[PDB]
């Protein structure tokens, strides 16, 4: 499934992933209510749920 970033995020641990408002990444799991794994640039981690919308 493919999500919308809404806003820009910075990674700030080595589990988090960085990602630019407007960007589309695909979503790899979506099980905590507040971090959700995705994919941007290449990379595979976390970013917060709230940043993101669903497609």
């Known amino acids: 499934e493919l999500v919308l970033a809404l806003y820009d995020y910075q990674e700030k641990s080595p589990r988090e992933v960085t990602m630019k408002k407007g960007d589309i990444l695909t979503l790899l799991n ?26």
């Open 30 to 55: 979506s099980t905590n209510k507040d971090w959700w794994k995705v994919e941007g640039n290449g990379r595979q981690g976390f970013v917060p749920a709230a940043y993101v919308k669903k497609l």
